[PDB]
Design an enzyme around this catalytic site. Sequence first.
Site, PDB file in Angstrom:
ATOM      1  N   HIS A 280     -26.927 101.195  17.226  1.00 57.51           N
ATOM      2  CA  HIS A 280     -27.394 100.460  16.033  1.00 57.51           C
ATOM      3  C   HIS A 280     -28.889 100.141  16.063  1.00 57.51           C
ATOM      4  O   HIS A 280     -29.510  99.885  15.024  1.00 57.51           O
ATOM      5  CB  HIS A 280     -26.592  99.153  15.886  1.00 57.51           C
ATOM      6  CG  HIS A 280     -27.093  98.243  14.801  1.00 57.51           C
ATOM      7  ND1 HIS A 280     -27.819  97.101  15.064  1.00 57.51           N
ATOM      8  CD2 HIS A 280     -26.978  98.313  13.453  1.00 57.51           C
ATOM      9  CE1 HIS A 280     -28.127  96.505  13.926  1.00 57.51           C
ATOM     10  NE2 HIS A 280     -27.628  97.219  12.932  1.00 57.51           N
TER      11      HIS A 280
ATOM     12  N   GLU B 180     -21.201 104.017  20.595  1.00 61.34           N
ATOM     13  CA  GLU B 180     -22.128 102.913  20.268  1.00 61.34           C
ATOM     14  C   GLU B 180     -23.282 102.735  21.274  1.00 61.34           C
ATOM     15  O   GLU B 180     -23.848 101.653  21.419  1.00 61.34           O
ATOM     16  CB  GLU B 180     -21.362 101.609  19.967  1.00 61.34           C
ATOM     17  CG  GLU B 180     -22.149 100.571  19.162  1.00 61.34           C
ATOM     18  CD  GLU B 180     -22.856 101.142  17.942  1.00 61.34           C
ATOM     19  OE1 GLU B 180     -22.302 102.036  17.258  1.00 61.34           O
ATOM     20  OE2 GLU B 180     -23.982 100.677  17.665  1.00 61.34           O
TER      21      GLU B 180
ATOM     22  N   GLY C  72     -28.704  88.800  17.857  1.00 64.27           N
ATOM     23  CA  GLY C  72     -29.788  88.988  18.817  1.00 64.27           C
ATOM     24  C   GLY C  72     -29.343  89.183  20.260  1.00 64.27           C
ATOM     25  O   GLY C  72     -30.179  89.268  21.162  1.00 64.27           O
TER      26      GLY C  72
ATOM     27  N   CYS D 264     -27.388  91.802  21.160  1.00 65.71           N
ATOM     28  CA  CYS D 264     -27.086  93.218  21.428  1.00 65.71           C
ATOM     29  C   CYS D 264     -27.995  93.819  22.486  1.00 65.71           C
ATOM     30  O   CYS D 264     -29.197  93.513  22.561  1.00 65.71           O
ATOM     31  CB  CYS D 264     -27.096  94.070  20.164  1.00 65.71           C
ATOM     32  SG  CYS D 264     -25.630  93.758  19.152  1.00 65.71           S
TER      33      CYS D 264
HETATM   34  C1  LIG Z   1     -26.127  92.699  17.772  1.00 66.66           C
HETATM   35  C2  LIG Z   1     -27.108  93.561  16.974  1.00 66.66           C
HETATM   36  C3  LIG Z   1     -28.030  92.797  16.051  1.00 66.66           C
HETATM   37  O1  LIG Z   1     -28.841  93.420  15.375  1.00 66.66           O
HETATM   38  O2  LIG Z   1     -27.978  91.347  15.927  1.00 66.66           O
HETATM   39  C4  LIG Z   1     -27.313  90.775  14.796  1.00 66.66           C
HETATM   40  C5  LIG Z   1     -28.093  91.000  13.514  1.00 66.66           C
HETATM   41  C6  LIG Z   1     -24.923  92.256  16.932  1.00 66.66           C
HETATM   42  C7  LIG Z   1     -24.039  91.283  17.731  1.00 66.66           C
HETATM   43  C8  LIG Z   1     -22.939  90.638  16.877  1.00 66.66           C
HETATM   44  C9  LIG Z   1     -23.483  89.800  15.715  1.00 66.66           C
HETATM   45  C10 LIG Z   1     -22.544  88.598  15.589  1.00 66.66           C
HETATM   46  N1  LIG Z   1     -21.851  88.673  16.869  1.00 66.66           N
HETATM   47  C11 LIG Z   1     -22.110  89.641  17.630  1.00 66.66           C
HETATM   48  O3  LIG Z   1     -21.751  89.745  18.797  1.00 66.66           O
HETATM   49  N2  LIG Z   1     -24.127  93.444  16.578  1.00 66.66           N
HETATM   50  C12 LIG Z   1     -23.891  93.750  15.294  1.00 66.66           C
HETATM   51  O4  LIG Z   1     -24.314  93.060  14.374  1.00 66.66           O
HETATM   52  C13 LIG Z   1     -23.070  94.985  15.027  1.00 66.66           C
HETATM   53  C14 LIG Z   1     -22.127  94.759  13.838  1.00 66.66           C
HETATM   54  C15 LIG Z   1     -21.006  93.790  14.176  1.00 66.66           C
HETATM   55  O5  LIG Z   1     -20.901  93.307  15.302  1.00 66.66           O
HETATM   56  C16 LIG Z   1     -20.005  93.402  13.114  1.00 66.66           C
HETATM   57  N3  LIG Z   1     -18.774  92.940  13.754  1.00 66.66           N
HETATM   58  C17 LIG Z   1     -17.631  93.629  13.676  1.00 66.66           C
HETATM   59  O6  LIG Z   1     -17.507  94.670  13.045  1.00 66.66           O
HETATM   60  C18 LIG Z   1     -16.439  93.090  14.388  1.00 66.66           C
HETATM   61  C19 LIG Z   1     -15.146  93.615  14.318  1.00 66.66           C
HETATM   62  C20 LIG Z   1     -14.429  92.783  15.147  1.00 66.66           C
HETATM   63  C21 LIG Z   1     -12.960  92.905  15.424  1.00 66.66           C
HETATM   64  O7  LIG Z   1     -15.224  91.838  15.691  1.00 66.66           O
HETATM   65  N4  LIG Z   1     -16.466  92.018  15.233  1.00 66.66           N
HETATM   66  C22 LIG Z   1     -20.559  92.310  12.180  1.00 66.66           C
HETATM   67  C23 LIG Z   1     -19.604  91.980  11.033  1.00 66.66           C
HETATM   68  C24 LIG Z   1     -21.014  91.025  12.867  1.00 66.66           C
HETATM   69  C25 LIG Z   1     -24.017  96.160  14.769  1.00 66.66           C
HETATM   70  C26 LIG Z   1     -23.313  97.464  14.447  1.00 66.66           C
HETATM   71  C27 LIG Z   1     -22.519  98.118  15.395  1.00 66.66           C
HETATM   72  C28 LIG Z   1     -21.895  99.325  15.071  1.00 66.66           C
HETATM   73  C29 LIG Z   1     -22.060  99.884  13.804  1.00 66.66           C
HETATM   74  F1  LIG Z   1     -21.448 101.050  13.508  1.00 66.66           F
HETATM   75  C30 LIG Z   1     -22.857  99.238  12.862  1.00 66.66           C
HETATM   76  C31 LIG Z   1     -23.482  98.033  13.178  1.00 66.66           C
END
Ligand SMILES: *[C@@H](CC(=O)OCC)[C@H](C[C@@H]1CCNC1=O)NC(=O)[C@@H](CC(=O)[C@@H](NC(=O)c1cc(C)on1)C(C)C)Cc1ccc(F)cc1
Lengths: 184, 181
Positions: B41, B72, B146, B148
């Site tokens: 991502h 990922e 933040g 990730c």
């Molecule tokens: C880290 C990346 C980032 O840029 O910071 C946030 C803007 C982030 C960590 C998560 C945010 C909230 N909690 C976290 O741990 N990762 C992401 O934002 C990914 C997207 C998600 O995590 C989604 N969550 C889910 O789909 C999900 C499903 C379940 C069962 O639990 N969570 C969001 C809805 C928060 C980034 C990402 C990963 C893979 C992709 F194909 C696209 C985007």
Amino acid sequence: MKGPAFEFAVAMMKRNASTVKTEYGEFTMLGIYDRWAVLPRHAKPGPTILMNDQEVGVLDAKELVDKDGTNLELTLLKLNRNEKFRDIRGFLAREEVEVNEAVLAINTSKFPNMYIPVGQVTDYGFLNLGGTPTKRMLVYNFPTRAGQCGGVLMSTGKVLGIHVGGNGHQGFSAALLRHYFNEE
Amino acid sequence: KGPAFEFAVAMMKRNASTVKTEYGEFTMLGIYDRWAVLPRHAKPGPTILMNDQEVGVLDAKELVDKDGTNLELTLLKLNRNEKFRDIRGFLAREEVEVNEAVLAINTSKFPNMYIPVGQVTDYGFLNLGGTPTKRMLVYNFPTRAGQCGGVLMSTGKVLGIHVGGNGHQGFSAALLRHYFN
Ligand SMILES: *[C@@H](CC(=O)OCC)[C@H](C[C@@H]1CCNC1=O)NC(=O)[C@@H](CC(=O)[C@@H](NC(=O)c1cc(C)on1)C(C)C)Cc1ccc(F)cc1
Ligand SMILES: *[C@@H](CC(=O)OCC)[C@H](C[C@@H]1CCNC1=O)NC(=O)[C@@H](CC(=O)[C@@H](NC(=O)c1cc(C)on1)C(C)C)Cc1ccc(F)cc1
Ligand SMILES: [Cl-]
Ligand SMILES: [Mg+2]
Ligand SMILES: [Mg+2]
């Protein structure tokens, strides 16, 4: 950086720490014994606090100063709750503690259960902190952030103090001394 | 929990950096030679900002399994003279489960923070951010934006890289040894 210091820190926060909101903001709070806890003085607790999202009455508060009235930047709070804290007074020193390696532990909405290896802690003493002459400051060098006040500064078997201030890459704790919990 | 924290702090000091892309700020773990790992991502361009310094990306590999399913992770080869300390020996052949893990973050929002996340389970398949994804490790803690790229560790083991979550559930992509040849 030590494993045992982190082990100690995590157990301490689990048993005795909470997230507290006052009218002045959100802080980490450390319970000390019975229903007595500590916050940074600038948390300015009133007669009711939010403790882990729950309204809790404050039965007494004591803003700590030295024998000449100089700010120590700590407030002791007696809580209207039936649960008791583990008595951690034995982990508090008689005088300001220095260590080679400390861990700063934070429990807030911004930093929910975070532990930071801050390196060496020095007994710095006097500091004009936020415009207020303050004593018994402990100093350490790490990238400081807003929302870390009330963070608990520890090493193995030692609670050194409570994070109260800083700027840039310098942080300061108020030393948490055992005699503070004696009426005198 | 102690040994996990001790291992984690040493690992981050030696092998971790803070990386900025258009898609935010990430923790980045160097693996060996000039090879490092980011969440896919992060979508690194031909240059990344690594500890506030522009660093050229020579190669980027978005990892998928034998049937093309997203893992990922993006492996990047950096145009740097300094080599990373080789940590491939800390990587497992298969997904690791442990009773106590530490998640380590180093960004401007979270500079050198370590989180005791408790138990790590091999969850497997997840539709993550709309993409079908495999080899997900799950743990329960209050997750935040933040985090990730955060490095998930236990005593003597690097388990994975934090890639997503919601509420009080976090997920890491398992960091397997064979990904690095
Ligand atoms: C880290 C990346 C980032 O840029 O910071 C946030 C803007 C982030 C960590 C998560 C945010 C909230 N909690 C976290 O741990 N990762 C992401 O934002 C990914 C997207 C998600 O995590 C989604 N969550 C889910 O789909 C999900 C499903 C379940 C069962 O639990 N969570 C969001 C809805 C928060 C980034 C990402 C990963 C893979 C992709 F194909 C696209 C985007
Ligand atoms: C913690 C308070 C907080 O954010 O709680 C939520 C409301 C905060 C931590 C510092 C902010 C930046 N880095 C930190 O570690 N504490 C404060 O903001 C106190 C005020 C300060 O720390 C000042 N700093 C200094 O005066 C200073 C001097 C030196 C050599 O280094 N720093 C600010 C200018 C940032 C709050 C406070 C404490 C005591 C007082 F008497 C008044 C106010
Ligand atoms: Cl290049
Ligand atoms: Mg009110
Ligand atoms: Mg367990």
